[PDB]
RNA sequence: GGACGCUAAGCCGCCCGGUGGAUGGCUCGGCUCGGGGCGCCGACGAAGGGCGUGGCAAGCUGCGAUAAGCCCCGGCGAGGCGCAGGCAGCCGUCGAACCGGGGAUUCCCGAAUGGGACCUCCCGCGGCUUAUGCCGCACUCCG
RNA sequence: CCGAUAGCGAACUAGUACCGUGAGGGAAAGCUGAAAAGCACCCCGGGAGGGGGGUGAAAAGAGCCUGAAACCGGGCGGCG
RNA sequence: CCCGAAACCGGUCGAUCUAGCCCGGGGCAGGGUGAAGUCCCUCAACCGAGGGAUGGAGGCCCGCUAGGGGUGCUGAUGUGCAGUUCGCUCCCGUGACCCCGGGCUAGGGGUGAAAGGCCAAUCGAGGCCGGAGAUAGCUGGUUCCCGCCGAAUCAUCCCG
RNA sequence: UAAGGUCCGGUGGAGCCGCCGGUAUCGCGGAUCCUGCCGGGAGUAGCAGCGUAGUCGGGUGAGAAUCCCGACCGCCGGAGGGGCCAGGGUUCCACGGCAAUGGUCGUCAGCCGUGGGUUAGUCGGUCCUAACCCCGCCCGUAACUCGGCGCGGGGGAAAGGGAAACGGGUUUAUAUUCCCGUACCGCGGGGGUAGGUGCGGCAACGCAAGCCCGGAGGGUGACGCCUCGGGGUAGGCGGACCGGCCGAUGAGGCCGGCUAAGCGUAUAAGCCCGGGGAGUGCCGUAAUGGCGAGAACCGGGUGAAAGCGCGAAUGGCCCCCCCGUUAGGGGGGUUCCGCCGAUCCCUGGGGCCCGUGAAAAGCCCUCCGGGAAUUCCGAUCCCCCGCGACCGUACCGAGAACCGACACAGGUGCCCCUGGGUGAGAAGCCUAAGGCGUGUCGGGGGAAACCCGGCCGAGGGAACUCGGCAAACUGGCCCCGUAACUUCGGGAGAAGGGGUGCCUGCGGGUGCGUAACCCGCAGGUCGCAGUGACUAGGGGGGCCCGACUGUUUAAUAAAAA
RNA sequence: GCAUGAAUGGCGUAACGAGGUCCCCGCUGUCCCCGGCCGGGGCCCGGCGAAACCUCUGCCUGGCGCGCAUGCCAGGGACC
RNA sequence: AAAUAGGCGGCCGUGGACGAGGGCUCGGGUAGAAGACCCGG
């Protein structure tokens, strides 16, 4: 496989996929001038990662 | 200064210096379960097999207490042998009984050291003690060494030789054939000689030819000094 | 996003065929770039738009003509080899042959019973030894020991 | 040895120890039964040192 | 898949589909013998096959009418010939 | 022959525009000191940690699938909906937001304790109920 | 007492980003304007960029208060 | 006044690098040569002698099979393609072989077919933090102006 | 004198001094100083070197040498390709983009943004035990998260063992799973019957497979090496037929013609059984060899794959003729005859040994049989009803998804070892299937000098040089022939000589009836040359050392160590 | 024997060797004595883009000087 | 480019008038790394 993924890591993935996300427009108006991207968008083949 | 050396590493319990224990199958006890008296046990011989771990033959014996254990074979065995155990066994071979029971001036095996514990003495394949001396005080039996020690009769012992012989040590031939037979045992081999191994390794020896100290050492020095020879009385053969 | 290279991957999977043998009219590219779906594409299949050219081996005229030779024993030669010992069948390999056949024969003079019993010793223990070559072989050394009439 | 080793081994590739759940650390090791960022495995407490070195790590962390 | 190495239980044989495509497939145990262990021959009459499966496969191929099974009836001869033996003297 | 009759490239200073982020003013932060308080808590399942949770949520903060919260009391009491000053939408003036005390729920992991375990999962009793729901239990003391 | 190449590593999503098998190591990132009025509408530009015009101050028009030097371009004055 | 090096000691962290051992598995085209054993055929009364077959051994040989090692060119490269590479050449290729996964051995200790070699880009004794702002007779450097006087580089002792 | 201060003009748009007495993290030219910013070098080197790929039309677009389609040409071809183990974690798929990223380039993309995709009783994990590990209790230590013994318990294999599943279809992305067909595991019920608490055959032995809680016992699970032969069929290739295509000449080639897992009925040499009794003792294998614990010789019984049927006239390929701008579809036919050669898969002998070669889950039998006790009982035999607590499944798996900071020529396991020609080869080269043209910059120039790979040189034959280092040379294969020395093995492929292509007619060997093959011979005959390319050892002796094979300074030292 | 010697092994040795040394034969551009050809570069152009190091300069010859100078001193050459 | 910078002969001038020589262009080299040189048009 990949070995592999308990039930509790698919959860931790999932944390790590929606930080790699630009942030919404929406944060940026409400704030009123602005806030950066800002690094914890994620790569693939450049991501070696410590638990 | 040097560290500890190839003895010293080998107490430890390292694992280059530890032997195997699951290839290993052996041990021979004439069951002291029941002590060195009673009449009470017999068995059969079961098998003759090898032991992996002693490289050796050995004879299984089922017991009518309904056990298996191994007791050293002798020569001129065959399966469907009867063994005795108790003083109430006859003198024969392969049979067991206390030394009183045992006439003098035959060849015996697999004695006791201390009363009541399937032997301490005389284990080895092909290697057979001889009784020379009977007394009911202390019966006198001649090692594989020569020496005579002194046994308290109410130990055990077996009629016979033991088998094999010419087969626990013959010729090594090469490095791959003798390679084999330390895996069956335990020895640090391929080893090489002090005298070139450094002054930090080893006492004797520099990185030339020559010596550093003499091989015959003091029997009262401490630890990591015991190298060359080794508690000696005398060297050497010639003048 | 305009890919074009998997539409022809799919096709392909449905001829059961590879992606470089899958032709797309150049006139009509346009209209395998509108369909996304399968089921578009097998329509244009059908529609000749998109088609197969089947995969192709090699001529082995070459071959049949070369092997023509060799089966008769010609075209060959020990400069025309290679091969080693092996290659001519070494000397296990014709023996092997040899004695197979050899008591198959035996046996079958014994029914044809123009050996006795007397003659057989001495054929069998001949027969190891490797005294023949083989059909033609026995054949003579019978004829010749005149034990064929016995 | 000598300098110019990361072309031999593929290595880091499979673990020697895992993470943790006592701290998250990957080093509850696989191999024994014990945490080298706080024990665990083989302990009940967790470590007691006035190094300082771990207890004030784990101060910043928390 | 999980081993691809030539095995005693993973060793493998070629087999066409239907459509002629051909896929490789994985084999397990293959035939193996049952032993009387009380003499050199084994135990005629006895299937061979994986051990396991002889539960739900004829138990009464492994039984030829005698009153112990697991003695062939060579061995059997035998043994007959000592109970009786021992029973007139 | 001397003449500025054409001396390009370039050198030096200054000027103007850019680059750059120094400089001054600015500071919801540090740092030190004085006074007082806090002065223990946990298998009655702690602290710590993990992953979710918001209309839109990337992080932080707060909570626990009752999920930026629920209830009760007393106090202050007329606008709110954390950081964040968008829109939609939500609730209160018939008592919200906020503050104090007290309560409900308070996932999984963790002393974690029945066992194993990359933060998950499975189980043997007994109470219980429609019942598997649901509640208590199976490491070590003393009766 | 110190003040954003200083004072806590950190005044601003910080022991965060990040590195290391691990133990452990470890930053940078403060300032629009009175009010966002944070640029409608129009010409041009493939153009979302930029430019022209209208933008109280815009040389406050988007890490935008102030805006140094080194440095780059053109020009002026002298030399060649 | 400030900086600058080799260290020592205590407690921790490392055998995913690499050494060896154990356990369960994997891999090696093809060929040559032809042992011992054994048979047959001819020749000989026999003794044997010759040929042939049979049989396949060897820490054997050959090899762009797969794989392993890494001798020369002191080549190419040498602010590289690459913190160890490329081509050619070379050794080994059924073996005291190679190779995977699990486990084991830890710092004056291991491991070592023995080089003081190796033990995570660090070994004539690993890294981490604390002691600690270690100590130096030793190198470098220590910031605003002005006025006045203005040298000694000799003498005794000292593991100096 | 100065350290330093003051004033003016512009900018800036809110705070700022002097005087006196205090205070110190109080004044810099340098520290191979620390930090930020910036220039020269330069628009140079690098974007060439390794087995070296694009080029012409056409489509799109703001823009096209490198995005796509078509044609043509290569490279790789048992392996810079396919499937996977590890790892990665979304890189997968889809749609929209070009500021950023790709050694140039970009409308393209794994970049940027946003949605969506991994569905399991019958695959594996879990489980078993292994090497071996950890916990509690006792004990030690002043003490411990330290330490091991003696007890008790648990853990421990994604390449070992295991009760058990395939094929087809569909999706943009998924599938042994979803769907469809067919098949099936284990336990719990029910309804029958073998069961007259098992029925038959002289026998080996046949089974619609023995009632019975308990405990015990006994087999099978269950294991090192290397030859030789027996068997199986996926499958390799020619001929003929049926369509399809290619087609100077109309020939020859290519291509599709298929049958799964699950079952039923049949296997057969080992191995048992009778008859018979081994005559100079007979008979055999490829061989060693078997025999009074049973020969020659005759019958039986019994346990591998195989064949056939079920599965299945389906289903699945391959085309052809009609609809239809099109949606969406319709109708057909072919779906075959052989013979012959192997990877692999299972079965018998045999040699080998001072390594003499883990265990358990699980099964099956047997001893005893509690009870029910023939009104008995049961359901391994059927058929029938119910089910499977849990985790995974996308993609890559690599000269861009691992790992080396990196898209670093590196370097890491398995399977594809059935592609053709070739030939001894899982070899070379050529050519396929299959993959790619991102082995990610191009264009130009009589293109000089000179450098890196590489080719040819007269006459001479090492004169060069520490040294023939480097290169040259032999060469493949077959025959003949071989010295000094010798541990009689070896030296040995010593040394040295000779042949080898193609066509035409025959022989032996294997087979089967001329099909399929293998190994030689003769005649004819061309060139400068027949291993013509590729592939492919120069040889000999003396002296020194270490016997040998092995090992050593991973990474200047592979040795006399 | 400057300064050998018997298991801190001596002498010898078949077979073996990516071991050290020497000689021969064949062969040969290593050489006398050099030339031509092939591919990648070189050189030019578009696009993409560093580094080492950096008080400053068009020098030469002598003398001097910390005795081994562009710059002092005396000569000499000098368009960029 | 000998600064004693030379001699001879001929040709020429006289964002915002007019324009002698000369190059770039083309076809090739006796020439040739770029450039230049040379010749034809």
Redesign the pocket.
């Known amino acids: 496989?990949?070995?592999?993924?308990?039930?509790?890591?698919?959860?931790?993935?999932?944390?790590?996929?929606?930080?790699?996300?630009?942030?919404?427009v929406?944060?940026i108006?409400?704030?009123?001038?602005?806030?950066?991207?800002?690094?914890?968008?994620?790569?693939?083949?450049?991501?070696?990662?410590?638990? | 200064?040097?560290?500890?050396?190839?003895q010293?590493?080998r107490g430890?319990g390292?694992?280059?210096?530890?032997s195997?224990?699951?290839?290993f199958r052996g041990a021979v006890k004439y069951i002291p379960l029941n002590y060195t008296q009673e009449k009470t046990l017999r068995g059969v011989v079961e098998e003759i097999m090898?032991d992996?771990?002693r490289?050796a033959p050995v004879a299984r014996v089922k017991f009518e207490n309904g056990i298996e254990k191994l007791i050293i074979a002798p020569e001129g065995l065959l399966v469907g042998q009867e063994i005795y155990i108790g003083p109430d066994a006859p003198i024969a071979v392969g049979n067991t009984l206390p030394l009183a029971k045992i006439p003098e001036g035959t060849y015996v095996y697999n004695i006791e050291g201390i009363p009541g514990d399937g032997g301490k003495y005389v284990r080895a394949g092909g290697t057979y003690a001889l009784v020379v001396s009977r007394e009911p005080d202390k019966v006198i039996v001649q090692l594989p060494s020569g020496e005579l020690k002194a046994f308290n009769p109410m130990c055990r012992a077996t009629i016979g030789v033991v088998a094999g012989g010419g087969?626990?040590?013959?010729?090594?031939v090469?490095?791959?054939?003798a390679?084999?037979?330390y895996?069956?045992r335990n020895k640090?081999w391929?080893?090489?000689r002090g005298?070139?191994?450094?002054?930090?390794?080893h006492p004797f020896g520099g990185?030339e030819?020559?010596?550093g100290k003499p091989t015959t050492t003091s029997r009262r020095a401490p630890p990591g000094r015991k190298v060359g020879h080794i508690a000696a009385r005398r060297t050497g053969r010639?003048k | 996003?305009?890919?074009?290279?998997?539409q022809?991957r799919?096709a392909a999977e449905?001829?059961?065929?590879?992606?470089?043998?899958?032709?797309?009219?150049?006139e009509r590219?346009?209209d395998v770039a509108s369909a996304?779906?399968?089921?578009?594409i097998?329509?244009l299949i059908?529609?000749g738009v998109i088609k197969?050219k089947?995969?192709?081996?090699?001529?082995?005229?070459?071959?049949?003509?070369?092997?023509e030779?060799?089966?008769?024993?010609?075209?060959?030669?020990?400069?025309?080899?290679?091969?080693?010992?092996?290659?001519?069948?070494?000397?296990?390999?014709?023996?092997?042959?040899?004695?197979?056949?050899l008591?198959?024969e035996?046996?079958k003079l014994?029914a044809q019973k123009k050996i006795d019993?007397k003659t057989?010793?001495?054929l069998?223990?001949?027969?190891?030894?490797?005294?023949f070559?083989?059909?033609?072989?026995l054949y003579l050394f019978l004829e010749e020991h005149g034990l064929l009439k016995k | 040895?000598?300098?110019?080793?990361?072309?031999?081994?593929?290595?880091?590739?499979?673990?020697?120890?895992?993470?943790?759940?006592?701290?998250?650390?990957?080093?509850?090791?696989?191999?024994?039964?014990?945490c080298?960022?706080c024990?665990?495995?083989?302990?009940?407490?967790?470590?007691?040192?006035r190094?300082s070195?771990?207890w004030?790590?784990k101060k910043?962390?928390? | 898949?999980?081993?691809?190495?030539?095995?005693?239980?993973?060793?493998?044989?070629?087999?066409?589909?239907?459509?002629?495509?051909?896929?490789?497939?994985?084999?397990?145990?293959?035939?193996?013998?049952?032993?009387?262990?009380?003499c050199g021959?084994?135990?005629?009459?006895?299937?061979?096959?994986?051990?396991?499966?002889?539960?739900?496969?004829?138990?009464?191929?492994?039984?030829?009418?005698?009153?112990?099974?697991?003695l062939?009836?060579?061995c059997m001869?035998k043994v007959m010939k000592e109970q009786i033996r021992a029973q007139l003297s």
């Open positions: 496989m990949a070995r592999n993924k308990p039930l509790a890591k698919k959860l931790r993935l999932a944390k790590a996929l929606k930080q790699n996300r630009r942030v919404p929406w944060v108006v409400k704030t009123n001038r602005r806030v950066l991207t800002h690094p914890k968008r994620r790569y693939w083949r450049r991501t070696k990662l410590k638990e | 200064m040097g560290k500890s050396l190839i010293q590493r430890k390292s694992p280059t210096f530890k195997p224990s699951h290839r090898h992996p771990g490289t087969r626990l040590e013959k010729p090594l090469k490095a791959g054939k390679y084999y037979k895996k069956a640090f391929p080893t090489p005298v070139k191994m450094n002054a930090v390794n990185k030819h020559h010596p010639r | 996003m305009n890919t074009l290279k998997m022809r799919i449905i001829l059961k065929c590879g992606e470089n043998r899958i032709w797309i009219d150049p590219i346009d996304i779906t399968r089921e578009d097998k329509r059908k529609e197969k089947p995969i192709k081996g090699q001529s082995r005229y070459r071959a049949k003509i070369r092997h030779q060799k089966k008769k024993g010609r075209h060959r030669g020990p400069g025309s080899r290679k091969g080693k010992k092996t290659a001519r069948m070494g000397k296990k390999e014709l023996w092997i042959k040899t004695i197979r056949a008591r198959k035996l046996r014994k019993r057989y010793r001495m069998y223990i001949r027969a190891k030894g490797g005294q070559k083989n059909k033609h072989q | 040895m000598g300098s110019g080793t990361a072309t031999f081994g593929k290595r880091n590739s499979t673990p020697t120890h895992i993470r943790c759940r006592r701290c998250g650390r990957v080093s509850y090791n696989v191999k024994k039964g014990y080298a960022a024990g665990f495995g083989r302990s009940r407490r967790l470590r007691k040192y190094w070195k771990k004030k790590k910043n962390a928390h | 898949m999980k081993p691809m190495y030539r095995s005693r239980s993973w060793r493998r044989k070629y087999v066409r589909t239907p459509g002629g495509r051909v896929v490789i497939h994985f084999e397990r145990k293959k035939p193996k013998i049952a032993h009387c262990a009380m021959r084994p135990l005629n009459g006895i299937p061979r096959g994986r051990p396991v499966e002889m539960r739900k496969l004829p138990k009464t191929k492994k039984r030829p009418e005698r009153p112990m099974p697991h062939c009836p060579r001869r």
